[PDB]
Design a protein around this nucleic acid. Structure first.
Ligand SMILES: [Ca+2]
Ligand SMILES: [Mg+2]
Ligand SMILES: [Mg+2]
Length: 430
DNA sequence: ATTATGACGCT
DNA sequence: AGCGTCATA
């Protein structure tokens, strides 16, 4: 009743760049614009592995993780851009720098949490309040929401996509009560107005297009963002949740796409998020633990409290290379040479990070994989990171891992190494 | 032979 | 600490 929290206290958005690495390459090379194209890494093995795909190329069935040679079978005219290679390995600097461009623009509008290289959560609660004041009970025009979808509308008693969008928008705005500054639906709507403006700014100042979700929390905002891509934004109201969740596979909700989601489905014998409402909080805790159970109980009702953390910079700076199949490292000279290549890229990124961001990493984490192990990482060891020097870091990395060498011969390395990873962590102000 | 990352949870 | 899970291009 009057004491039941509805999780409508905040306005939260999730902004996600459309086919990000592709857009970075298309800005640089106009010949790639408005074409089926993809970004690939390496080239020798099956034409390279695809890591990003334009919407034009997706229409042919091209996807992430596909070999370019196979993608070319679906899309003969597919254009490719290759990730830069430095020191024998893929180098993602261009994309990291493009990400910074976008994150800095978003930060002008509100506090953001960097969620990945191409997405950020935005806490719009305060900005919405401000804007509501300037508004002075004034109605919100559809013209202010030119790329917004209202999930679940239109409904009730045109055959084009943009027509449906506008019909839904009209029904929503027609129902809106603007004299109530505390109406959660109004708050979301003003949130959407602001996100339109943020998205226009990103495009104007970078050339990049993105999509966005606007709701009352991070999980719903993230889900909303994916509902209408590319180049559009979607508002998911509290009221829209029961219908939305009634047919939403559990695995679509962030954090349930893996083993836990699978167990929820298996143990409870359900398929859709909405079916969770029929269990008690204690029942859910009994199966999935205290934390996950409480989270599930609230989430299936559209409620979640994870804050947008004020963090625009990554917490770690890492460098990784796989050495698949026959390329696995089997000699000490090999292992040392590659530890050095990695350490050299790490040093470059760390030094730049110190100058830009006034901080210094203090821990070096070294991880390897050995041939045969099914896990992504076989062994993780840490040592002190006291100086930004590539020769030192690589020597230290070798020191922490050298005991892994089963070989009776000092010069040989067995079992061969299929992955090396150096990560700088535990930053302190400087 | 997806790869190269990056955040957070468990014990 | 070191391992595991889930997620990004
Ligand atoms: Ca994206
Ligand atoms: Mg993304
Ligand atoms: Mg993606």
């Amino acid at each position: 009743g009057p004491h039941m929290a509805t999780g409508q206290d905040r306005v939260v958005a999730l902004v996600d760049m459309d086919c990000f690495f592709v857009q970075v390459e298309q800005r640089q090379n106009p010949h790639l614009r408005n074409k089926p194209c993809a970004v690939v890494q390496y080239k020798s093995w099956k034409g390279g592995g695809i890591i990003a795909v334009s919407y034009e190329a997706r229409a042919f069935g091209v996807t992430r993780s596909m070999w370019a040679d196979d993608a070319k079978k679906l899309c003969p005219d597919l254009l490719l851009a290759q990730v830069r290679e430095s020191r024998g390995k893929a180098n993602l600097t261009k994309y990291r720098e493009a990400s910074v461009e976008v994150m800095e623009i978003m930060s002008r509008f509100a506090v953001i949490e960097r969620a990945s290289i191409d997405e950020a959560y935005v806490d719009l609660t305060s900005a919405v309040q401000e804007r509501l004041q300037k508004l002075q009970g004034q109605p919100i025009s559809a013209d202010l929401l030119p790329s917004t979808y209202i999930e679940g509308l239109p409904q009730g008693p045109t055959v084009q996509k943009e027509g449906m969008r506008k019909q839904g928008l009209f029904q929503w705005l027609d129902s809106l009560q603007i004299d109530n500054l505390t109406s959660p639906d109004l708050q979301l709507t003003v949130g959407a107005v602001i996100v339109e403006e943020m998205r226009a700014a990103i495009e104007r100042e970078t050339g990049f297009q993105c999509s966005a979700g606007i709701s009352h929390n991070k999980v719903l905002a993230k889900l909303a963002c994916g509902l209408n891509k590319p180049n559009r934004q979607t508002l998911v109201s509290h009221g829209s949740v029961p219908q939305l969740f009634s047919q939403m596979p559990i695995r679509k909700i962030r954090s349930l796409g893996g083993k836990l989601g699978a167990s929820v489905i298996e143990i409870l014998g359900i398929e859709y998020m909405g079916e969770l409402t029929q269990f008690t909080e204690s029942q859910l805790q009994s199966h999935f633990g205290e934390k996950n159970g409480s989270w599930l109980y609230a989430m299936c009702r559209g409620i979640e409290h994870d804050p947008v953390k004020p963090r625009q910079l990554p917490k770690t700076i890492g460098c990784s290379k796989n050495f698949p199949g026959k390329t696995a490292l089997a000699t000490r000279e090999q292992v040392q040479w590659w530890l050095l290549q990695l350490a050299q890229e790490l040093e470059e990124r760390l030094t730049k990070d110190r100058n830009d961001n006034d901080r210094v990493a203090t821990q070096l984490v070294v991880s390897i994989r050995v041939q045969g192990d099914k896990r992504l990482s076989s062994l993780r060891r840490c040592c002190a990171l006291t100086r930004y020097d590539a020769h030192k870091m690589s020597h230290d990395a070798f020191t922490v891992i050298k005991n892994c060498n089963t070989s009776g011969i000092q010069t040989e390395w067995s079992p061969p190494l299929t992955m090396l990873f150096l990560c700088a962590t535990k930053f302190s102000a400087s």
